[PDB]
């Protein structure tokens, strides 16, 4: 049932781990066995729950496992039986993007079933109003399909249907599963604080801001900023993979070095203004027009 699902997903990540035996986060060779190990722990703890019904622990696992399988098939399809170094290598980018997604699915699973043991009914968000929004709208649930989440979020922060809502969905759905967990919502509301202007912060900082990069790794940021070494004060920003919920700002320093920093942890709008004023964050993605 659930146990059969969990056995299948374990063996599937072991296959991928063996197919990856040919580093620096996010690393598939690290994430796959850690995710497998956590799933072994989930399997044993459920053979013993939180409140059942829609969006409880069982629902989360069903959705999570069906997504993990889809993503594992994508990875499997890029790997030979037992070139990454060509410029513009499609294989390198697809693997990098998939490693990002496994990094997020590993973090989400660890947040909600640490040691195998479900805590989605007790989970507390980092920002208080976001916490209160979730629990007053979704109760003890830990996950929602996008459409229901969109509808619920709209009681407070409505998003224009169509292109904008899909852009929002892409930003929030870190695991690319079509569902929003309490964890994902935690991550989003930390990144785009403060709460009273949530979606306007998002519009300004992500949709309309040339410095915003989605689904880039640390090494992809170092590589992109190569183009800007002669432009001190060029910068971009993206979600940290190792510190989920925090921004990683990549910038070109005074000496043409490419540095990356985590500004723990005020609204990004304030970090940006303060860098602008001081002369560190002047040219988003190397371009003239700082928003």
């Amino acid at each position: 049932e659930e146990a059969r699902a969990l056995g299948r997903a374990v063996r599937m990540l072991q296959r991928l781990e063996e197919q990856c035996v040919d580093v620096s986060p996010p690393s598939l060779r690290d994430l796959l066995p850690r995710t497998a190990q956590l799933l072994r722990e989930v399997a044993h703890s459920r053979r013993a729950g939180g409140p059942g019904g829609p969006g409880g622990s069982g629902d989360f696992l069903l959705i999570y496992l069906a997504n993990l399988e889809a993503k594992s098939r994508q990875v499997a399809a890029l790997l030979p039986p037992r070139e990454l170094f060509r410029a513009g290598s499609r294989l390198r980018r697809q693997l990098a993007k998939l490693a990002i997604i496994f990094s997020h699915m590993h973090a989400e699973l660890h947040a909600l079933f640490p040691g195998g043991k479900y805590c989605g009914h007790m989970y507390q968000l980092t920002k208080a109003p976001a916490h209160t929004f979730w629990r007053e709208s979704c109760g003890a649930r830990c996950v929602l399909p996008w459409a229901e989440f969109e509808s619920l979020l709209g009681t407070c922060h409505p998003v224009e249907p169509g292109c904008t809502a899909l852009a929002l969905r892409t930003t929030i759905d870190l695991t690319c599963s079509g569902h929003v967990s309490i964890f994902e919502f935690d991550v989003f509301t930390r990144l785009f604080q403060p709460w009273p202007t949530l979606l306007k912060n998002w519009q300004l900082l992500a949709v309309n801001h040339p410095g915003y990069m989605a689904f880039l790794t640390y090494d992809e940021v170092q590589e992109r900023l190569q183009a800007c070494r002669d432009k001190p004060g060029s910068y971009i920003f993206r979600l940290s993979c190792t510190r989920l919920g925090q921004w990683a700002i990549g910038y070109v320093s005074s000496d043409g070095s490419i540095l990356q920093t985590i500004p723990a942890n005020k609204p990004l709008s304030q970090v940006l203004l303060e860098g602008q004023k001081d002369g560190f964050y002047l040219y988003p993605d190397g371009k003239t027009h700082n928003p």
């Binding site: 320093s253 920093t261 970090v271 860098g275």
Partner: peptide, 8 residues
């Protein structure tokens, strides 16, 4: 070294 000090 990976992530460096916030240059504020």
């Amino acid at each position: 070294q990976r992530y460096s000090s916030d240059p504020t």
